[PDB]
Every structure is written in C-alpha cells, then in structure tokens.
Amino acid sequence: MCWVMPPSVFVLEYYLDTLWKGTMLFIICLVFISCNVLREVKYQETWCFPAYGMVIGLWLMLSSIPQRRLVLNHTRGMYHFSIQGRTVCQGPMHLVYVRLALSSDAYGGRFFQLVLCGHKLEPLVLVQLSERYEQMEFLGRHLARKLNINYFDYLASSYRHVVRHWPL
Amino acid sequence: MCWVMPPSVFVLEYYLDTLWKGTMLFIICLVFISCNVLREVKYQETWCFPAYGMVIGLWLMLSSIPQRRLVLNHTRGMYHFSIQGRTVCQGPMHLVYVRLALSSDAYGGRFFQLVLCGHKLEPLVLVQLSERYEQMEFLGRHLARKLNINYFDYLASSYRHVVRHWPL
Amino acid sequence: MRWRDRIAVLCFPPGLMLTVAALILFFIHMGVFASDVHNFCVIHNYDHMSFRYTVVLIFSQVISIGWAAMGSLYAEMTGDKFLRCFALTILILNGAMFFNRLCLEFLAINYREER
Amino acid sequence: MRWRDRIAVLCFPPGLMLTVAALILFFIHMGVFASDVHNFCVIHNYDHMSFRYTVVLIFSQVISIGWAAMGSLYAEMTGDKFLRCFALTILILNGAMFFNRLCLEFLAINYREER
Numbered sequence: 097m098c099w100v101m102p103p104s105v106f107v108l109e110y111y112l113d114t115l116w117k118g119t120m121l122f123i124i125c126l127v128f129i130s131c132n133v134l135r136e137v138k139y140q141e142t143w144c145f146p147a148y149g150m151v152i153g154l155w156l157m158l159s160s161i162p163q164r165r166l167v168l169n170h171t172r173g174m175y176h177f178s179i180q181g182r183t184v185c186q187g188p189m190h191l192v193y194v195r196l197a198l199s200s201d202a203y204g205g206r207f208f209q210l211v212l213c214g215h216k217l218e219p220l221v222l223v224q225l226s227e228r229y230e231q232m233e234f235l236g237r238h239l240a241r242k243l244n245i246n247y248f249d250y251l252a253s254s255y256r257h258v259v260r261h262w263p264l
Numbered sequence: 265m266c267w268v269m270p271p272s273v274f275v276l277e278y279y280l281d282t283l284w285k286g287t288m289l290f291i292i293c294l295v296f297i298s299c300n301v302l303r304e305v306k307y308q309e310t311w312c313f314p315a316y317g318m319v320i321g322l323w324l325m326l327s328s329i330p331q332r333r334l335v336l337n338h339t340r341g342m343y344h345f346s347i348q349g350r351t352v353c354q355g356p357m358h359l360v361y362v363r364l365a366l367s368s369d370a371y372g373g374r375f376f377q378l379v380l381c382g383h384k385l386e387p388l389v390l391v392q393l394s395e396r397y398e399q400m401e402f403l404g405r406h407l408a409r410k411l412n413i414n415y416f417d418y419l420a421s422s423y424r425h426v427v428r429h430w431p432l
Numbered sequence: 433m434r435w436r437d438r439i440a441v442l443c444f445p446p447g448l449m450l451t452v453a454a455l456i457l458f459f460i461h462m463g464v465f466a467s468d469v470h471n472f473c474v475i476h477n478y479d480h481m482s483f484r485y486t487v488v489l490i491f492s493q494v495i496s497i498g499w500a501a502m503g504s505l506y507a508e509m510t511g512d513k514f515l516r517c518f519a520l521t522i523l524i525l526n527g528a529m530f531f532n533r534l535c536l537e538f539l540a541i542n543y544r545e546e547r
Numbered sequence: 548m549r550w551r552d553r554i555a556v557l558c559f560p561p562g563l564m565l566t567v568a569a570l571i572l573f574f575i576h577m578g579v580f581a582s583d584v585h586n587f588c589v590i591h592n593y594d595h596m597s598f599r600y601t602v603v604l605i606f607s608q609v610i611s612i613g614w615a616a617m618g619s620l621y622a623e624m625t626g627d628k629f630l631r632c633f634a635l636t637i638l639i640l641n642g643a644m645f646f647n648r649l650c651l652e653f654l655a656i657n658y659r660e661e662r
C-alpha cells in the first residue's frame with residue numbers, strides 16, 4: 097500500500113465513515129430491541145434510549161456522500177470541488193493546501209494528523225499511526241511529484257515547509 | 265394628491281396591505297368565537313374552520329414590512345433595493361422599469377394597472393380607477409422629470425413608449 | 433444570496449411555505465388516519481372515533497390538495513428539477529391519502545348515525 | 548451559493564441540524580409538559596400520568612440542552628447576529644424549560660411511589 101496510493105493517477109476520490117458508525121449503531125440497537133433487560137421493578141421502561149438510537153442513526157444514514165473528488169488530474173486542472181451531481185466550490189489556486197496538524201492531551205502526548213485544507217475539502221488522516229515524526233516531508237514530496245501545490249507545517253511559515261503557488 | 269406624490273422628493277418608500285387582511289381575519293374571529301351558530305343537531309362542530317383562518321391570519325400578520333425603499337433620490341443613485349436591516353438586490357440600471365399591465369375578463373372589459381418592474385420590486389397600482397385611458401404619458405413624463413428611466417407600454421416596443429437608459 | 437437573512441425576517445422565499453404547510457398537513461392527516469385505522473381494527477372504541485369531526489376535516493383535505501397543487505404551480509418555474517420533483521411527490525401523496533380516507537369514510541358508513 | 552441544492556441532497560449546511568432537533572424536542576416537551584399540568588390540575592387521572600417514564604425524558608432533557616449549546620457553539624462563528632440570537636434564544640428557553648420541569652417534578656414527589 098506504500099507505493100499504490102502516492103501516484104493517484106489523475107483524480108483521487110474520497111468518502112466518509114459515518115456509514116460505518118451508523119452501521120454498528122443499527123446492529124447494537126437491533127440487538128437492544130429483542131430481549132432487553134426487564135426492569136419493570138425499577139418503575140421505568142428504557143425503550144426510549146433506543147428510540148434516540150433510531151433517530152440518531154436514521155439521521156446519520158441521511159448523510160450520503162458519493163465519491164468526493166476534485167480536478168487534481170495531472171494537468172492544468174483548477175482543483176474545482178466536484179461531486180457527482182452538484183458542484184459548490186471553485187478557485188484559482190491559493191486555497192488548496194496540505195497541512196500538518198498536532199493535538200495534545202493533559203499529559204502532553206502529541207498526535208499528528210494531515211489535512212488537505214480548502215473550502216470544505218476532505219482531510220488526509222493516516223491509518224492509526226501517529227507517535228513519531230518518521231519522515232514527514234517525503235509524502236509531501238510525493239504530492240509535489242503529483243501536482244506540486246504546498247506542504248505546510250505547524251505554526252507559521254518560518255522554515256521546514258514548502259510552497260509552490262502564491263497569489264502574492 | 266396630484267401635486268404631492270408625483271413630486272416624491274428623493275426617496276419614495278412603500279408598503280403592503282396584507283396587514284389589513286390579517287386584522288380583518290382577527291376581527292371576524294372575534295365575531296365568531298363568542299356565540300357562534302349552535303349546530304350540534306347537525307352532528308358537527310365548526311370550530312376548526314376559524315382555526316384554519318387563524319393559521320392563515322397569523323401567517324399573513326407575520327409578513328411585516330419596514331418601508332420598502334430604493335435609491336430613487338434625485339441624484340446619480342443606482343436604484344439599490346433598500347430595506348431597513350437587510351439588503352437584497354443591487355443592479356446598475358437597465359432593470360428598473362415602469363410598465364403598463366392589462367387584464368381582461370370573459371366579457372372583454374379591460375383593467376389597467378401599473379408596475380414598477382424590477383428584481384422583486386413593488387408595483388404602482390393606482391387607487392381603484394381604471395375604465396378609460398385618460399392621459400397615459402402624463403404620469404410617465406412626471407416620472408421622467410423625477411428620475412427619468414423608462415415608461416413601457418403593452419406588447420413589444422413598436423411606438424408610444426419611452427426609454428432613457430439602454431444596456432445595448 | 434444570504435438565505436440566513438432570507439429565512440430570518442420580514443418575508444419568506446416565494447413559495448416554500450405552501451409546501452411546508454402541505455408537509456404538516458400531510459403529517460397531521462396521517463396521524464388522524466392512523467388513529468382511525470387503529471381504533472377501528474382492534475380496540476373498538478366507537479365512542480372516541482372521529483365520527484364527530486367529519487366534514488370540517490374533509491374541507492381541510494380539499495384545501496390541502498389545492499394549496500399543494502397551486503404551490504407546485506408557484507414553484508415550477510424555478511427551472512430546478514428537485515423542487516418540481518418535491519412538489520409533485522407531495523401532490524401525489526396528498527391525493528393518495530385523500531382517496532384512502534374517502535374510501536375509509538365510504539366504507540365506515542353504518543357506524544355514525546342515521547338520517 | 549445554491550441553497551436549494553444545499554438543502555436538497557447529500558448533506559446539510561454546518562450547524563442548523565442540532566438547532567432544528569432542539570426545536571422538535573422543544574415541541575414534544577411542551578406537549579408532555581402541557582399534558583402533565585393539565586392532568587395534575589383538573590382531570591385527575593394519575594394512572595395515565597407520566598409517572599411511568601421519568602428518567603428517560605430527563606436524559607432527553609439534558610442531551611437536548613447539550614445539543615442546543617453545541618449547535619450554538621458551532622454556529623457562533625458565522626459572523627451574523629441573527630444566528631447567534633437564534634441559538635441564544637433557543638438555549639435560554641430550553642434552560643428555563645428544564646428548570647421549570649425540574650421544579651414540577653420535585654413538587655410531584657408524594658404521588659409516584661415509595662422506597
């Protein structure tokens with residue numbers, strides 16, 4: 097998987113995982129429906145917490161996302177924000193970035209994620225591996241080989257980050 | 265009145281008459297509620313018809329309107345659709361017109377109205393007097409003396425209608 | 433333009449409230465129909481049927497169909513297929529519900545009173 | 548942009564989900580609160596009280612408070628005063644609602660059951 101994804105021939109495509117979340121919610125609540133706890137001695141029925149499960153899940157299935165794509169094809173594409181059907185965002189450069197983001201807890205442990213910044217764009221969250229910096233800029237270099245745009249690091253410009261287009 | 269409103273120093277202001285319809289609906293319900301007809305021998309209760317009346321009357325009363333105005337100030341004003349609070353329509357000329365409109369019944373009687381045409385503008389309905397053509401272009405020439413834009417007749421251009429600004 | 437301000441104050445967009453009136457009308461009429469069917473089938477509580485409110489809610493039905501239809505007419509010329517599909521689907525379900533309630537009212541005729 | 552297409556399919560504008568959910572929660576909770584005060588004041592048929600569902604609607608109350616606050620926090624950054632006023636008003640009415648129903652429940656102790 098280390099070599100397959102860096103090229104991303106022409107377009108990229110993307111999706112969301114709220115369908116997964118609603119899926120185990122639906123499984124859990126269907127389990128809850130049949131043979132729940134019998135707490136009539138508690139002078140209360142707890143069937144309405146699954147009713148909220150119904151509501152939350154049905155709303156989450158109401159968020160369907162077909163193949164979030166852009167105009168990232170290896171050409172003079174404008175990175176217009178493209179969905180099957182409707183289209184919303186357009187822009188001549190200066191909005192699409194790839195930025196490193198950091199999060200911290202009370203103890204001080206640092207967690208590193210990546211976000212394809214833009215007008216209502218999709219992130220670049222890696223698959224559950226964030227404890228060390230490893231190589232960082234190499235993936236930005238592969239993105240640069242793709243359609244060189246940006247590679248933004250934490251805080252301000254300073255150093256250690258790369259830009260390709262600027263509106264001055 | 266013939267020398268008061270056609271002058272119209274600077275801005276004009278306008279309103280709707282739906283407040284009257286709402287207040288008459290409230291009046292007729294205050295008539296109905298106390299001692300209505302007693303048709304229990306009809307095996308029916310007729311209290312829900314005024315419930316619908318108050319639904320539509322409260323909706324009509326909710327249509328509040330502070331002084332629909334424009335930039336008809338006797339200057340190089342660009343005729344921006346102005347409302348106390350929010351503002352919607354802005355346009356550099358070629359959209360504000362004053363047009364004659366015609367209506368006909370089955371017999372063939374003609375009813376004449378006037379409309380200040382534009383992007384969600386207000387009309388120029390005269391006070392319940394349209395049986396003869398009378399003077400036609402006199403009020404159009406008064407509007408021309410005010411802030412000369414247009415006076416549009418029925419059908420196509422042909423003749424007998426006046427323009428001052430054209431977008432080509 | 434700013435639909436926050438369009439939905440905020442002083443007005444509504446053209447149409448788009450006739451449709452929501454049709455929605456709440458369809459909701460409450462489905463509630464009434466479900467109550468009638470539930471009370472007719474099992475529990476047999478002819479005292480507490482809607483045998484008393486008969487013609488007013490039928491007039492409500494017909495003004496609901498008229499409002500939905502003329503709202504569809506008022507929203508058709510926007511040039512967008514989604515609004516037309518929404519209005520036509522609401523018209524279809526309103527007509528189907530009216531016909532279903534008319535059939536139920538005609539079937540349950542020996543249960544109200546005699547003239 | 549095209550708010551027709553924004554409200555049509557596949558998503559909703561950010562925020563304005565939790566606010567509408569809090570509105571419908573407010574509606575159903577005025578329904579049950581009005582039923583409770585009605586049956587506590589006049590008709591006196593405590594067997595059909597909401598003496599049976601007592602903690603799940605309290606949980607619904609606090610989660611509705613949380614969602615109203617969370618939607619207010621998520622919609623404050625729009626830069627528009629109308630949205631902030633909307634969110635603050637719905638939060639205030641929900642909170643005063645919660646205090647009122649808590650006071651009513653605390654007044655209605657001697658009528659439920661005894662441990």
Ligand SMILES: CC(C)CCC[C@@H](C)[C@H]1CC[C@H]2[C@@H]3CC=C4C[C@@H](O)CC[C@]4(C)[C@H]3CC[C@]12C
Nearest residue numbers: 144147148151575579594595596597600604607
């Ligand atoms: C799940 C989220 C959206 C909250 C929804 C709560 C609903 C399901 C709850 C809250 C209030 C409840 C009602 C409160 C009072 C009554 C009257 C009682 O004699 C029988 C139960 C009945 C008819 C309840 C039915 C279920 C009910 C409507």
Ligand SMILES: CC(C)CCC[C@@H](C)[C@H]1CC[C@H]2[C@@H]3CC=C4C[C@@H](O)CC[C@]4(C)[C@H]3CC[C@]12C
Nearest residue numbers: 312315316319460464479480481482485489492
């Ligand atoms: C917006 C309004 C005007 C349209 C809907 C009309 C409303 C007010 C009407 C139509 C259906 C009606 C209900 C139909 C059935 C029942 C059961 C009956 O045994 C007592 C009256 C009751 C509880 C009615 C109360 C009033 C009601 C809800």
